PDB file of C-alpha atoms in Angstrom:
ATOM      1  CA  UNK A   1       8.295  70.288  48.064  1.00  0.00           C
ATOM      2  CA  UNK A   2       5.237  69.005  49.846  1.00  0.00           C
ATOM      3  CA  UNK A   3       3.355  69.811  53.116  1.00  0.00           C
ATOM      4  CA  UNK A   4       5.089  67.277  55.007  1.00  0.00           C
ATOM      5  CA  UNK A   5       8.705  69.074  53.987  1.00  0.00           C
ATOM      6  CA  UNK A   6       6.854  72.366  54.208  1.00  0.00           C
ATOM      7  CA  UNK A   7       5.865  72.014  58.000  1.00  0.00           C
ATOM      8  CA  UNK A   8       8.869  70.646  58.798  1.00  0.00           C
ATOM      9  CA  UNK A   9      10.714  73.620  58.068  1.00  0.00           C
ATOM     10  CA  UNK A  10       8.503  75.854  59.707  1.00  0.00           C
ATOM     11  CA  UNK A  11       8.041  73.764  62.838  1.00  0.00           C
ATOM     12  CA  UNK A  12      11.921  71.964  63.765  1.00  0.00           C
ATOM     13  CA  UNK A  13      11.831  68.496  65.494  1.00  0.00           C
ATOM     14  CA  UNK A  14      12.260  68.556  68.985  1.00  0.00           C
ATOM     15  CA  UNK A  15      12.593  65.270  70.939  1.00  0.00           C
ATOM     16  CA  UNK A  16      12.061  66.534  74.383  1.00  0.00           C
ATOM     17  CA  UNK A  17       9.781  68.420  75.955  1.00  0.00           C
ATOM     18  CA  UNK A  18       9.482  72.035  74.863  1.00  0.00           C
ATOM     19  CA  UNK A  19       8.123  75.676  75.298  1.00  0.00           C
ATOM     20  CA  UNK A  20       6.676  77.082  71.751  1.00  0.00           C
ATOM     21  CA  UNK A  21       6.569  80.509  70.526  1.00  0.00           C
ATOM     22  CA  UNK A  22       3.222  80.883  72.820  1.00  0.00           C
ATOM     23  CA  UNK A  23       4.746  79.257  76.115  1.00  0.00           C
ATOM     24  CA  UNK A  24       2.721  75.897  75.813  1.00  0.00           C
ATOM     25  CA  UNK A  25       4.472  72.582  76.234  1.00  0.00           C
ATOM     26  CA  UNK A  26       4.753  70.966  72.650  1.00  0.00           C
ATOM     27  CA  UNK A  27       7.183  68.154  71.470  1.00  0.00           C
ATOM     28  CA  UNK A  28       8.130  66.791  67.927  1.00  0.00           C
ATOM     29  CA  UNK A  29       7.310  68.696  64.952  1.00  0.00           C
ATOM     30  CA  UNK A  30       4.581  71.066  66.294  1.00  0.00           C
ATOM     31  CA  UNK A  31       2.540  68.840  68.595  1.00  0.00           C
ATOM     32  CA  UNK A  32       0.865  70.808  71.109  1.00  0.00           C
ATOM     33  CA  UNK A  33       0.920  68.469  74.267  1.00  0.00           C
ATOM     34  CA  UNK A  34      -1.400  71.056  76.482  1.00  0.00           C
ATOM     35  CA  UNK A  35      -2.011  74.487  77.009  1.00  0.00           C
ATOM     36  CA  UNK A  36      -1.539  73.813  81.020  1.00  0.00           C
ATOM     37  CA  UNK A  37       1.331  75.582  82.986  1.00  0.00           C
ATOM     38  CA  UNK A  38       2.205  72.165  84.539  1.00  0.00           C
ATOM     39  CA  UNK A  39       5.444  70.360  83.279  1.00  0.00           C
ATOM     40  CA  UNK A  40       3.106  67.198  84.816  1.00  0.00           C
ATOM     41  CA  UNK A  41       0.335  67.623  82.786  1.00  0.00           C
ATOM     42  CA  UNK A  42       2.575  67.738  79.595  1.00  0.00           C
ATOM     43  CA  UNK A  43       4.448  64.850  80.557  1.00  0.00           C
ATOM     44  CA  UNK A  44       0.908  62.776  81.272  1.00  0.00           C
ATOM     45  CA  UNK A  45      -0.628  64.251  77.959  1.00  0.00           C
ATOM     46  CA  UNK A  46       2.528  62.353  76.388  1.00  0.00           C
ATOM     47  CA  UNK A  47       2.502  59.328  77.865  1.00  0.00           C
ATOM     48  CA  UNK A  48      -1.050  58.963  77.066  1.00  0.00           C
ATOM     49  CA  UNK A  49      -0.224  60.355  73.341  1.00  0.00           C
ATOM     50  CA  UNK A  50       2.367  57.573  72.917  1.00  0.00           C
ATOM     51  CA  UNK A  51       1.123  55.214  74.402  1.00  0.00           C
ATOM     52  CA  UNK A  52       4.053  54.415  76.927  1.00  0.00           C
ATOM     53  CA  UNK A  53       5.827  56.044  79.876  1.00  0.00           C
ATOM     54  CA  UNK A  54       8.121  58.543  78.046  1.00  0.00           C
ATOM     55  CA  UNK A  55       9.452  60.628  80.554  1.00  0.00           C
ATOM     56  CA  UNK A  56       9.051  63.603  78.257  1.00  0.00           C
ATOM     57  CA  UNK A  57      11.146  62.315  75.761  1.00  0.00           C
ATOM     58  CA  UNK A  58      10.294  60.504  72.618  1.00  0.00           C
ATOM     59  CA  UNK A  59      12.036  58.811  69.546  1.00  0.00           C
ATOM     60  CA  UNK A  60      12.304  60.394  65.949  1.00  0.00           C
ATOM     61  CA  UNK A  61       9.947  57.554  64.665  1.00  0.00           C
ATOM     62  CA  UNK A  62       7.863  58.459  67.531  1.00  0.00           C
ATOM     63  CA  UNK A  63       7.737  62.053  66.565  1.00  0.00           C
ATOM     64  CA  UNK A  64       7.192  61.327  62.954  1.00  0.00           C
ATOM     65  CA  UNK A  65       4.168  59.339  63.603  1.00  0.00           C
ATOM     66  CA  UNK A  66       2.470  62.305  65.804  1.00  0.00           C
ATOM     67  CA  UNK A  67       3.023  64.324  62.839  1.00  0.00           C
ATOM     68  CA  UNK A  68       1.434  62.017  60.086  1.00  0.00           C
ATOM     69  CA  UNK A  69      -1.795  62.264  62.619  1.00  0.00           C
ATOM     70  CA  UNK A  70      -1.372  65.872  63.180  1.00  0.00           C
ATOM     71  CA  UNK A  71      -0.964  66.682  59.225  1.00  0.00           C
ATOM     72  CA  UNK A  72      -4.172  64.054  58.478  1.00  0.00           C
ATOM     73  CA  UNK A  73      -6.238  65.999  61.344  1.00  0.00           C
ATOM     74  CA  UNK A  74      -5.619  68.847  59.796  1.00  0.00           C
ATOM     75  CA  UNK A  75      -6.846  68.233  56.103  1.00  0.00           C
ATOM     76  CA  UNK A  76      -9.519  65.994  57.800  1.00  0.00           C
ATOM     77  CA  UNK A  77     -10.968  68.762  59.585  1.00  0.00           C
ATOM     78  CA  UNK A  78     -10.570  71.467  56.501  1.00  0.00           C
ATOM     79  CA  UNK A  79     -12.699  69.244  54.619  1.00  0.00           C
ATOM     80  CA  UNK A  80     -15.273  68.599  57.358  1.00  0.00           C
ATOM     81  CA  UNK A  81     -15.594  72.451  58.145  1.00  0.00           C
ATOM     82  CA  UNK A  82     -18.364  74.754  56.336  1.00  0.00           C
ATOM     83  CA  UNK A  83     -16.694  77.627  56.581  1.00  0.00           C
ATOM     84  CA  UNK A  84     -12.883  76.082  55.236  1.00  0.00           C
ATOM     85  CA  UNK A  85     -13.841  73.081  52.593  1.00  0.00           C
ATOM     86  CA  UNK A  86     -15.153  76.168  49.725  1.00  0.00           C
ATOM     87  CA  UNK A  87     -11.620  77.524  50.093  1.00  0.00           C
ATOM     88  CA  UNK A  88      -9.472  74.659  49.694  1.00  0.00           C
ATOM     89  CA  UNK A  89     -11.953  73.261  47.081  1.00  0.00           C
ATOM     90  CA  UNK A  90     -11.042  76.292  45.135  1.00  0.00           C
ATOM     91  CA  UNK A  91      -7.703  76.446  45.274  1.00  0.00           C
ATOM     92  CA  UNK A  92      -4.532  75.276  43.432  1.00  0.00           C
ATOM     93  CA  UNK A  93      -2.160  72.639  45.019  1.00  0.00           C
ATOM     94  CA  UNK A  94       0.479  74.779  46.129  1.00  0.00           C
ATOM     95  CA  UNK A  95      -1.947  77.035  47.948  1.00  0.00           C
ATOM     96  CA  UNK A  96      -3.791  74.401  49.637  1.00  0.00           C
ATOM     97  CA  UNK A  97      -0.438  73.435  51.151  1.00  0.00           C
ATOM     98  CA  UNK A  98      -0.340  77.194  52.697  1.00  0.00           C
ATOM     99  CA  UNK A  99      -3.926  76.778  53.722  1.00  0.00           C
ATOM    100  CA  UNK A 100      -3.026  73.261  55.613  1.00  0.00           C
ATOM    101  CA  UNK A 101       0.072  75.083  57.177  1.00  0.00           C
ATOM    102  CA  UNK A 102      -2.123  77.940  59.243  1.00  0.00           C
ATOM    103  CA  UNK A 103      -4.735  75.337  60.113  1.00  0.00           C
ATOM    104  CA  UNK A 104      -1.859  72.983  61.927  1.00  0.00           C
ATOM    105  CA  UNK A 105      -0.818  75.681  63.620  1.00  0.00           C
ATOM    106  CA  UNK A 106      -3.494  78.172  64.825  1.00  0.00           C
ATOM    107  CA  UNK A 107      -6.409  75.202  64.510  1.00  0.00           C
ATOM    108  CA  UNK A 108      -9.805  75.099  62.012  1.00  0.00           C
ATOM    109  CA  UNK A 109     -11.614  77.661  64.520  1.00  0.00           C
ATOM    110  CA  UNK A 110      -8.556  79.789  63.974  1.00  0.00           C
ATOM    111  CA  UNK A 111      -8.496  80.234  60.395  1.00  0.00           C
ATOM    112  CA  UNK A 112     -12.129  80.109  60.157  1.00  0.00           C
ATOM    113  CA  UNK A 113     -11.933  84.015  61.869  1.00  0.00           C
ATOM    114  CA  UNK A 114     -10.706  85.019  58.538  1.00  0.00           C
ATOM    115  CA  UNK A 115     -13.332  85.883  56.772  1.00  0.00           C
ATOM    116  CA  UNK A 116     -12.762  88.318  54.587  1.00  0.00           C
ATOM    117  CA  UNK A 117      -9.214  86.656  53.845  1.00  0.00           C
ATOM    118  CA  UNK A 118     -10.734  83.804  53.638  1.00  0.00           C
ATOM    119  CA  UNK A 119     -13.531  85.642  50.905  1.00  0.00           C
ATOM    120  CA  UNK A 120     -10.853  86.996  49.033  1.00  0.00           C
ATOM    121  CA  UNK A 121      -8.945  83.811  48.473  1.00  0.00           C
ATOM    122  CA  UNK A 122     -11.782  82.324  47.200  1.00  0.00           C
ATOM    123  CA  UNK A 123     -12.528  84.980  44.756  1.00  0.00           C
ATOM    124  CA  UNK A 124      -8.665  84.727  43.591  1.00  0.00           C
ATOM    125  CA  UNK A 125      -7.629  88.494  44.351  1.00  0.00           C
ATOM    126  CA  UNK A 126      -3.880  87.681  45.624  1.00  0.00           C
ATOM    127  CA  UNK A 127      -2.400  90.105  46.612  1.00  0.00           C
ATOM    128  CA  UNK A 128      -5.587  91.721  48.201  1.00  0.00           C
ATOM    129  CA  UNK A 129      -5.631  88.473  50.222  1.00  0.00           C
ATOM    130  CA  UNK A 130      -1.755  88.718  51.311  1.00  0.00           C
ATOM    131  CA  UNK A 131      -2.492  92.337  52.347  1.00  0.00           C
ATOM    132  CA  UNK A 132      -5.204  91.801  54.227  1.00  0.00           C
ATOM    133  CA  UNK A 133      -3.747  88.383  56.170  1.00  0.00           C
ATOM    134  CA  UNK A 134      -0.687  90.528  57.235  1.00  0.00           C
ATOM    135  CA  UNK A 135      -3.024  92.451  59.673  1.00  0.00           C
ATOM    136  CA  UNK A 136      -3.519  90.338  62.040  1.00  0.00           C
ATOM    137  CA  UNK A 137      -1.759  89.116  65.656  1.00  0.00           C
ATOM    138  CA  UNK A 138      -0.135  85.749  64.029  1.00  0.00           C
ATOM    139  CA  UNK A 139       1.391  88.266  61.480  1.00  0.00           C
ATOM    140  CA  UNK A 140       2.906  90.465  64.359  1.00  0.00           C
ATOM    141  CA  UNK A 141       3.719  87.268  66.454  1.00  0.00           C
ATOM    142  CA  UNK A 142       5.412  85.227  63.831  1.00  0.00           C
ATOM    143  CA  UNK A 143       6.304  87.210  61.322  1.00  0.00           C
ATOM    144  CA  UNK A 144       8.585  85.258  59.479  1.00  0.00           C
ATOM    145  CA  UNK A 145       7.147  82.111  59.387  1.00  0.00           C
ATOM    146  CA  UNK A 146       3.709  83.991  58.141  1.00  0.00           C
ATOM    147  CA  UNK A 147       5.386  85.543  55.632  1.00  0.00           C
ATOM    148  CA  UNK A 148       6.583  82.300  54.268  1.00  0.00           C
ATOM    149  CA  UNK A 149       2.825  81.732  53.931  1.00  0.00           C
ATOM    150  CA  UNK A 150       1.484  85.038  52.811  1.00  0.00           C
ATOM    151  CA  UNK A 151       3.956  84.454  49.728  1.00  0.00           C
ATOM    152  CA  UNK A 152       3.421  81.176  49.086  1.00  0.00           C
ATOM    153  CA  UNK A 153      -0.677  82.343  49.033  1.00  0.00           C
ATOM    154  CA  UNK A 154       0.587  84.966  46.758  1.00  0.00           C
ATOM    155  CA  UNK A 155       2.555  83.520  44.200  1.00  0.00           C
ATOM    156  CA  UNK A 156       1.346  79.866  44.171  1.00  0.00           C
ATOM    157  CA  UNK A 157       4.927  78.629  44.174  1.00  0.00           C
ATOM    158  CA  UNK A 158       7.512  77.534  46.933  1.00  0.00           C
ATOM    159  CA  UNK A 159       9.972  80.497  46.308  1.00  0.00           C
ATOM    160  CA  UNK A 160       9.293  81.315  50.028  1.00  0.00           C
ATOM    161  CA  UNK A 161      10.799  78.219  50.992  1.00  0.00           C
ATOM    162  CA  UNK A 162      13.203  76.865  48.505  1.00  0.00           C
ATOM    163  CA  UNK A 163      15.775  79.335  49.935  1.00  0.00           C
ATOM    164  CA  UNK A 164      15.277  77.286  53.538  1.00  0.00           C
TER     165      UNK A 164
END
């Protein structure tokens, strides 16, 4: 398994225009187009994201690529943030993936609110950490697809998704 595999799973692929979980116009695997109550200014933020006149719908190859920028961004931005690079320089391969995963979908700023998940990551304490990240509104939201996470912080293995 991999993060690419791993995302796909949690996010689906979607080649026209949807609503997520939050009610914000997204298409592909997980690519938030805007958080703008306009249908119009989803379908511009897509046409300018593709770089052609979609009319909210794209290819699979289109939707692919969105993702290999999205998934890039992501790590990009881990490793540029202050508050995010001491984790994932700490941390095992398999949990990195699980760190990548809540950064793609509640964004750097996001997961940097953590702290003290963040703090006990870092210092190792597992299930400590999966406690303490369960208490929180993307927990309540989400479950499911943060429990996927939480285990996967908590055992350092894919059991969470290998079912899936």
């Amino acid at each position: 398994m991999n993060i690419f595999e791993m995302l796909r799973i949690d996010e689906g692929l979607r080649l026209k225009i949807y609503k997520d979980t939050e009610g914000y116009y997204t298409i592909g695997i997980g690519h938030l187009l805007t958080k703008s109550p306009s249908l119009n200014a989803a379908k511009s933020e897509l046409d300018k994201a593709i770089g052609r006149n979609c009319n909210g719908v794209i290819t699979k190859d289109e939707a692919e690529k969105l993702f290999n920028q999205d998934v890039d961004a992501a790590v990009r931005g881990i490793l540029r943030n202050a508050k995010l690079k001491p984790v994932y320089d700490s941390l095992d391969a398999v949990r990195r993936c699980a760190l990548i995963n809540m950064v793609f979908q509640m964004g750097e700023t996001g997961v940097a609110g953590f702290t003290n998940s963040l703090r006990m990551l870092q210092q190792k304490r597992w299930d400590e950490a999966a406690v303490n990240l369960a208490k929180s509104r993307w927990y309540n939201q989400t479950p499911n697809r943060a429990k996927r996470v939480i285990t996967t912080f908590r055992t350092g293995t894919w059991d969470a998704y290998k079912n899936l």
